Design an enzyme around this catalytic site. Structure first.
Site, PDB file in Angstrom:
ATOM      1  N   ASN A 185       0.806  -1.233   0.000  1.00 26.62           N
ATOM      2  CA  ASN A 185       0.000   0.000   0.000  1.00 26.62           C
ATOM      3  C   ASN A 185       0.840   1.285   0.000  1.00 26.62           C
ATOM      4  OD1 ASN A 185      -2.097  -1.827   2.186  1.00 26.62           O
ATOM      5  ND2 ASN A 185      -2.554  -1.390   0.019  1.00 26.62           N
ATOM      6  N   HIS A 187       3.143   2.246   2.105  1.00 32.59           N
ATOM      7  CA  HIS A 187       3.454   2.760   3.436  1.00 32.59           C
ATOM      8  C   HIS A 187       4.756   2.110   3.911  1.00 32.59           C
ATOM      9  CE1 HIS A 187      -0.113   5.049   4.425  1.00 32.59           C
ATOM     10  NE2 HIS A 187      -0.816   4.170   3.709  1.00 32.59           N
ATOM     11  N   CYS A 222       6.489   7.396   9.287  1.00 28.36           N
ATOM     12  CA  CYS A 222       7.460   8.073   8.445  1.00 28.36           C
ATOM     13  C   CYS A 222       6.860   7.987   7.030  1.00 28.36           C
ATOM     14  CB  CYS A 222       8.820   7.382   8.508  1.00 28.36           C
ATOM     15  SG  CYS A 222       9.991   7.923   7.227  1.00 28.36           S
TER      16      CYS A 222
END
Ligand SMILES: OCn1cnc2ccccc21
Ligand SMILES: OCn1cnc2ccccc21
Ligand SMILES: OCn1cnc2ccccc21
Ligand SMILES: OCn1cnc2ccccc21
EC number: 3.1.2.14
Lengths: 264, 263
Positions: A185, A187, A222
């Site tokens: 995804n 991330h 992050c």
């Protein structure tokens, strides 16, 4: 892998690969953490999922709040490690996923882990307590009597972690994720933060000690364009460290944690 | 995994993991490259090794000179991919390890790879070419008739790669290895360089295209304390020329090319 007889936990075996081991020819703690996330995903797949049908409608996702791993023996390259995992509700706070690692040949427990997860709207990033109708959807896949990987009374998995104060004793600056650090995804993978924490441990410790315990709180993620600084200070035959990950610019905290190391 | 009936090649099956896939829910080329190195290591283990007894005495090791991978279909998360690998001597120049990737359900070839390896003294880093009865020691584990993953004449795996000239069209600077990027001997893993090459590919290409071919030359190693710049220029399907060099003095560590197909 497969669900156990009662259908309330999942077990999977893994043969440790050549690129998964460190200088000791045993699996790194990042390899272990990837195997914990893999058996978690296969468990969710086996029961029809990680989000329920109602969660996807409301744009809600599960997000890790804390990860705690304790390893007694790291499996060597070519060894088979068996991992059992299960989930349990903790009221409206969220859910806990636990794991037990075992040596497939001896049947001895070589490690254990526990993690706390909270519900969050994927778009606004706002957290919320678990609703009744959403909770009801996954209660049928969890044991009803408590089953804890860390049953002890004053156990390490529930201890509060303080904020490291400057100046840090050690630091690794300018850490940035590459595409391999992202999940499907886009991330940053939760295991990448473990790697970044460990970047500021001095080489001398890595050479003379083995990592026994790691507890990591996740405060903020992050982003792909963020840059991170990893900070470490000794707090202590055993060495203990306090850890802090913060954004390189403004110093916004993304993670805090502690590690415990024992002499080889 | 297991050696085949004739004992001259090795096959192993892999179930693609959740953390091994990209946005497309299919395995990344770095996951593929790690699986190629894993089946190579298991093949060496199965025949008694990946250094021979006499190579350890002479402090000699195998080092990659070139890696070439061509993927037709990337396996999705949960799919089983079967990989067959074998080695072959190429005179005294060095050895070649080849791989064939297949869909375990259909039996169709989904990919292929080839790599060139040279002998090097681990201490001086000097290329001592394959000499004496060192060759004889591993000739017994290789097929004698040629067996090529890329048989075609004047194929992509043999093409010379030019040096990218400044200014590069795209760049990713300040790349540094972390402990996860190291192997069990504390050297940067060969797959890390593939990741670093791809860091300078624009996101727009990654979103609209799929990586079909990658050829990478290895000239010099990145040390644990080195910092790398990844440079890319379009040479065209889309084709790119790539260069990895040390951040400071610009010393070349790798050069390569990629070919991408519209999704
Ligand atoms: O591979 C990185 N690394 C650093 N400290 C470690 C401790 C345990 C496993 C891996 C570790
Ligand atoms: O991934 C979500 N999730 C929450 N409770 C669970 C219980 C079993 C499997 C997955 C579960
Ligand atoms: O996630 C890594 N990555 C970046 N560009 C790619 C192209 C193909 C496969 C994996 C790729
Ligand atoms: O990396 C060692 N090596 C060289 N030729 C080989 C043939 C088979 C297995 C391992 C081999």
């Amino acid at each position: 892998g497969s669900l156990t007889e009662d259908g309330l936990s999942y077990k999977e075996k893994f043969v440790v690969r050549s690129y998964e081991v460190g200088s000791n020819k045993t699996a790194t703690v990042e390899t272990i953490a990837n195997l914990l996330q893999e058996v978690g995903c296969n468990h969710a797949q086996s029961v029809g999922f990680a989000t329920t049908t109602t969660m996807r409608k409301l744009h809600l996702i599960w997000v890790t709040a804390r990860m705690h791993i304790e390893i007694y023996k790291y499996p060597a390259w070519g060894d088979v490690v068996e991992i059992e995992t299960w989930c349990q509700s903790e009221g409206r706070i969220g859910t806990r996923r636990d794991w037990i690692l075992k040596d497939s040949v001896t049947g001895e427990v070589t490690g254990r882990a526990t993690s706390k997860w909270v519900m969050m709207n994927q778009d606004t990033r706002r957290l919320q307590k678990v609703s009744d109708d959403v909770r009801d959807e996954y209660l049928v896949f969890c044991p009803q009597e408590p089953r804890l990987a860390f049953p002890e009374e004053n156990n390490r998995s529930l201890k509060k972690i303080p904020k490291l104060e400057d100046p840090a004793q050690y630091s690794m600056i300018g850490l940035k994720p590459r595409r391999a650090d992202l999940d499907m995804n886009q991330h940053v993978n939760n295991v990448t933060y473990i790697g970044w924490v460990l970047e500021s441990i001095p080489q001398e410790i890595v050479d003379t000690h083995e990592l026994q315990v790691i507890t990591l709180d996740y405060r903020r993620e992050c982003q792909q364009d963020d840059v991170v600084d990893s900070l470490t200070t000794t707090t202590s035959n055993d060495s203990q460290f306090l850890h802090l990950l913060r954004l390189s610019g403004d110093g916004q905290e993304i993670n805090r944690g502690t590690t415990l190391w024992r002499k080889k």
